[PDB]
Swiss-Prot record:
Name of the protein in question: Peptidyl-prolyl cis-trans isomerase F, mitochondrial
Annotated source species: Homo sapiens
Reaction catalysed by this enzyme: [protein]-peptidylproline (omega=180) = [protein]-peptidylproline (omega=0)
Modified residues (N6-succinyllysine): 24, 43, 132, 147
Leading EC class: isomerase
Free-text description of this protein's post-translational modifications in UniProt: Acetylated at Lys-124; deacetylated at Lys-124 by SIRT3.
Regulation: Inhibited by cyclosporin A (CsA). Is displaced by CsA from the mPTP leading to a lower open probability of the mPTP.
One GO location term (cellular component): mitochondrion
Assembly: Associates with the mitochondrial membrane ATP synthase F(1)F(0) ATP synthase; the association is increased by inorganic phosphate (Pi) and decreased by cyclosporin A (CsA). Interacts with ATP5F1B; ATP5PD and ATP5PO. Interacts with SLC25A3; the interaction is impaired by CsA. Interacts with BCL2; the interaction is impaired by CsA. Interacts with TP53; the association implicates preferentially tetrameric TP53, is induced by oxidative stress and is impaired by CsA. Interacts with C1QBP. Interacts with MCUR1.
Domain PPIase cyclophilin-type per the UniProt entry, residue ranges: 6-162
Main location: mitochondrion
Positions bearing S-nitrosocysteine: 160
GN (gene name): PPIF
Enzyme Commission number(s): 5.2.1.8
Family label: Belongs to the cyclophilin-type PPIase family.
Length: 164
Protein backbone atom coordinates (compact mmCIF):
# COMPACT_ATOMS: atom_id res chain seq x y z
CA UNK A 1 0.00 0.00 0.00
CA UNK A 2 1.35 3.42 -1.01
CA UNK A 3 1.32 5.68 2.07
CA UNK A 4 -1.28 8.40 2.41
CA UNK A 5 -0.35 11.57 4.28
CA UNK A 6 -2.15 14.81 5.08
CA UNK A 7 -1.31 18.49 5.43
CA UNK A 8 -3.74 20.74 7.32
CA UNK A 9 -3.01 24.29 6.16
CA UNK A 10 -3.91 27.71 7.55
CA UNK A 11 -3.54 31.27 6.29
CA UNK A 12 -2.82 33.81 9.03
CA UNK A 13 -4.30 31.33 11.50
CA UNK A 14 -7.50 30.64 9.56
CA UNK A 15 -7.92 27.00 8.49
CA UNK A 16 -8.01 26.33 4.78
CA UNK A 17 -8.68 22.59 5.05
CA UNK A 18 -6.84 19.36 4.42
CA UNK A 19 -4.71 18.13 1.52
CA UNK A 20 -4.33 14.35 1.25
CA UNK A 21 -1.36 13.08 -0.73
CA UNK A 22 -0.59 9.60 -2.06
CA UNK A 23 3.16 8.93 -1.92
CA UNK A 24 4.40 6.73 -4.75
CA UNK A 25 6.51 4.34 -2.67
CA UNK A 26 5.98 1.79 -5.46
CA UNK A 27 8.28 3.87 -7.75
CA UNK A 28 10.36 6.10 -5.45
CA UNK A 29 10.43 4.38 -2.05
CA UNK A 30 13.31 6.38 -0.54
CA UNK A 31 11.79 9.73 -1.49
CA UNK A 32 8.33 8.70 -0.37
CA UNK A 33 9.66 7.53 3.00
CA UNK A 34 11.50 10.83 3.56
CA UNK A 35 8.27 12.77 3.03
CA UNK A 36 6.17 10.30 5.06
CA UNK A 37 8.50 10.61 8.05
CA UNK A 38 8.68 14.40 7.77
CA UNK A 39 4.87 14.45 7.90
CA UNK A 40 4.73 12.24 11.00
CA UNK A 41 7.59 14.09 12.65
CA UNK A 42 9.01 10.80 13.89
CA UNK A 43 12.65 11.91 13.54
CA UNK A 44 11.91 14.90 15.80
CA UNK A 45 11.63 17.42 12.97
CA UNK A 46 9.40 17.82 9.98
CA UNK A 47 6.76 19.90 8.34
CA UNK A 48 4.44 20.68 11.28
CA UNK A 49 4.55 24.42 11.95
CA UNK A 50 6.48 25.31 8.82
CA UNK A 51 5.27 27.36 5.89
CA UNK A 52 4.59 27.49 2.19
CA UNK A 53 7.32 30.08 1.62
CA UNK A 54 7.22 30.42 -2.18
CA UNK A 55 3.89 30.29 -3.99
CA UNK A 56 3.66 31.27 -7.64
CA UNK A 57 0.24 31.24 -9.32
CA UNK A 58 0.03 29.08 -12.41
CA UNK A 59 3.19 27.27 -11.35
CA UNK A 60 3.48 25.66 -7.91
CA UNK A 61 3.28 25.98 -4.11
CA UNK A 62 6.61 25.28 -2.35
CA UNK A 63 7.08 24.38 1.29
CA UNK A 64 9.21 22.30 3.60
CA UNK A 65 12.04 24.65 4.62
CA UNK A 66 11.54 24.12 8.34
CA UNK A 67 15.01 25.43 9.24
CA UNK A 68 15.25 28.78 7.42
CA UNK A 69 11.70 29.32 6.16
CA UNK A 70 12.94 30.96 2.96
CA UNK A 71 13.95 28.35 0.41
CA UNK A 72 17.56 27.89 1.56
CA UNK A 73 17.18 25.24 4.25
CA UNK A 74 15.66 22.03 5.53
CA UNK A 75 17.07 18.54 5.83
CA UNK A 76 16.15 15.01 4.86
CA UNK A 77 15.75 12.02 7.21
CA UNK A 78 18.95 10.57 5.61
CA UNK A 79 21.29 13.29 6.73
CA UNK A 80 21.30 16.73 5.24
CA UNK A 81 20.72 15.76 1.62
CA UNK A 82 20.08 12.74 -0.56
CA UNK A 83 20.50 11.93 -4.25
CA UNK A 84 17.84 12.04 -6.93
CA UNK A 85 16.26 8.59 -6.66
CA UNK A 86 14.93 8.48 -10.23
CA UNK A 87 13.05 10.71 -12.69
CA UNK A 88 10.43 8.09 -13.58
CA UNK A 89 7.36 10.15 -12.68
CA UNK A 90 6.65 13.33 -14.67
CA UNK A 91 5.21 16.74 -13.79
CA UNK A 92 2.05 15.89 -15.65
CA UNK A 93 -0.36 18.44 -14.24
CA UNK A 94 -2.03 19.94 -11.20
CA UNK A 95 -1.58 18.06 -7.95
CA UNK A 96 1.85 16.62 -8.69
CA UNK A 97 4.03 16.42 -5.56
CA UNK A 98 7.74 16.82 -6.25
CA UNK A 99 11.07 17.53 -4.55
CA UNK A 100 12.44 21.06 -4.53
CA UNK A 101 16.19 21.20 -4.99
CA UNK A 102 19.11 23.46 -5.80
CA UNK A 103 20.58 21.32 -8.55
CA UNK A 104 21.36 17.65 -8.95
CA UNK A 105 21.37 15.44 -5.85
CA UNK A 106 20.24 18.14 -3.43
CA UNK A 107 17.00 16.71 -1.97
CA UNK A 108 16.30 17.60 1.62
CA UNK A 109 12.87 18.42 2.96
CA UNK A 110 11.62 21.11 0.62
CA UNK A 111 8.87 20.08 -1.74
CA UNK A 112 6.29 21.53 -4.07
CA UNK A 113 2.77 20.87 -5.26
CA UNK A 114 2.22 21.81 -8.89
CA UNK A 115 -0.83 23.73 -10.01
CA UNK A 116 -0.03 23.22 -13.68
CA UNK A 117 1.92 20.81 -15.87
CA UNK A 118 5.55 21.77 -15.34
CA UNK A 119 7.31 19.65 -17.97
CA UNK A 120 10.51 21.77 -17.87
CA UNK A 121 11.14 20.23 -14.44
CA UNK A 122 11.03 16.65 -15.77
CA UNK A 123 14.40 15.05 -15.25
CA UNK A 124 15.46 17.74 -12.79
CA UNK A 125 13.05 17.33 -9.86
CA UNK A 126 12.03 13.97 -8.40
CA UNK A 127 8.26 13.50 -8.53
CA UNK A 128 7.04 11.25 -5.74
CA UNK A 129 3.31 11.67 -5.20
CA UNK A 130 0.00 13.29 -6.03
CA UNK A 131 -2.90 15.10 -4.34
CA UNK A 132 -5.89 12.76 -4.00
CA UNK A 133 -8.13 15.07 -1.95
CA UNK A 134 -8.01 18.77 -1.24
CA UNK A 135 -6.85 20.21 -4.55
CA UNK A 136 -9.28 23.04 -3.70
CA UNK A 137 -7.09 23.76 -0.64
CA UNK A 138 -4.00 23.81 -2.88
CA UNK A 139 -5.79 26.38 -5.05
CA UNK A 140 -6.54 28.44 -1.93
CA UNK A 141 -2.83 28.36 -1.06
CA UNK A 142 -1.99 29.39 -4.64
CA UNK A 143 -4.36 32.37 -4.36
CA UNK A 144 -2.11 33.83 -1.63
CA UNK A 145 0.93 33.74 -3.90
CA UNK A 146 2.37 36.26 -6.31
CA UNK A 147 4.59 36.39 -9.38
CA UNK A 148 7.66 36.82 -7.09
CA UNK A 149 6.57 33.87 -5.00
CA UNK A 150 6.11 36.04 -1.91
CA UNK A 151 2.91 35.21 -0.05
CA UNK A 152 0.30 37.72 1.05
CA UNK A 153 -0.61 35.71 4.16
CA UNK A 154 1.54 33.35 6.25
CA UNK A 155 0.60 29.89 4.96
CA UNK A 156 1.39 27.32 7.67
CA UNK A 157 1.17 23.54 7.81
CA UNK A 158 -0.75 23.53 11.11
CA UNK A 159 -0.68 19.76 11.33
CA UNK A 160 0.45 16.83 9.20
CA UNK A 161 0.74 13.10 9.50
CA UNK A 162 -0.02 9.75 8.00
CA UNK A 163 -3.47 8.25 7.45
CA UNK A 164 -3.52 4.57 8.42
N1 LIG B 1 4.34 28.54 -18.00
C1 LIG B 1 5.43 29.16 -17.19
C2 LIG B 1 5.45 29.02 -15.62
O1 LIG B 1 6.83 29.18 -15.24
C3 LIG B 1 7.37 29.68 -14.01
C4 LIG B 1 8.83 29.14 -14.11
N2 LIG B 1 9.87 29.47 -13.13
C5 LIG B 1 10.92 28.42 -13.10
O2 LIG B 1 10.84 27.45 -13.80
C6 LIG B 1 12.06 28.57 -12.14
C7 LIG B 1 13.29 29.15 -12.84
C8 LIG B 1 14.59 29.08 -11.98
N3 LIG B 1 14.28 29.76 -10.70
C9 LIG B 1 14.80 29.11 -9.48
O3 LIG B 1 15.47 28.12 -9.50
C10 LIG B 1 14.41 29.90 -8.21
C11 LIG B 1 15.16 29.92 -7.12
C12 LIG B 1 14.64 30.57 -5.86
O4 LIG B 1 13.50 30.92 -5.73
N4 LIG B 1 15.58 30.63 -4.83
C13 LIG B 1 15.26 31.17 -3.48
C14 LIG B 1 15.72 30.14 -2.44
C15 LIG B 1 17.15 29.84 -2.57
C16 LIG B 1 17.63 29.43 -3.89
C17 LIG B 1 19.18 29.50 -4.10
C18 LIG B 1 19.83 28.67 -2.96
C19 LIG B 1 20.32 29.30 -1.83
C20 LIG B 1 20.89 28.53 -0.82
C21 LIG B 1 20.98 27.17 -0.95
C22 LIG B 1 20.53 26.56 -2.11
C23 LIG B 1 19.93 27.31 -3.11
C24 LIG B 1 17.03 30.26 -4.95
C25 LIG B 1 17.11 28.05 -4.45
O5 LIG B 1 17.34 27.67 -5.56
N5 LIG B 1 16.38 27.25 -3.49
C26 LIG B 1 15.82 26.03 -4.01
C27 LIG B 1 15.22 25.16 -2.99
C28 LIG B 1 16.16 24.29 -2.12
C29 LIG B 1 15.80 22.99 -1.92
C30 LIG B 1 16.58 22.20 -1.09
C31 LIG B 1 17.70 22.70 -0.50
C32 LIG B 1 18.37 21.75 0.52
C33 LIG B 1 18.75 22.39 1.69
C34 LIG B 1 19.30 21.68 2.75
C35 LIG B 1 19.38 20.31 2.67
C36 LIG B 1 18.95 19.66 1.52
C37 LIG B 1 18.41 20.37 0.44
C38 LIG B 1 18.04 24.03 -0.68
C39 LIG B 1 17.26 24.83 -1.51
C40 LIG B 1 14.66 26.47 -4.92
O6 LIG B 1 13.83 27.28 -4.65
N6 LIG B 1 14.63 25.82 -6.20
C41 LIG B 1 13.68 26.21 -7.22
C42 LIG B 1 12.50 25.30 -7.45
C43 LIG B 1 11.87 24.84 -6.31
C44 LIG B 1 10.76 24.05 -6.44
C45 LIG B 1 10.26 23.75 -7.71
C46 LIG B 1 10.88 24.19 -8.87
C47 LIG B 1 12.00 24.97 -8.74
C48 LIG B 1 12.71 25.49 -10.01
C49 LIG B 1 12.18 26.91 -10.27
O7 LIG B 1 11.68 27.63 -9.47
N7 LIG B 1 12.41 27.26 -11.65
Amino acid sequence: GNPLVYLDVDANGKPLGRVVLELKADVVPKTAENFRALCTGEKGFGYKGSTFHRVIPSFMCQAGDFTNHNGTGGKSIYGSRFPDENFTLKHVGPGVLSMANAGPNTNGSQFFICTIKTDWLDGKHVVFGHVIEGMDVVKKIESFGSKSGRTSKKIVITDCGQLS
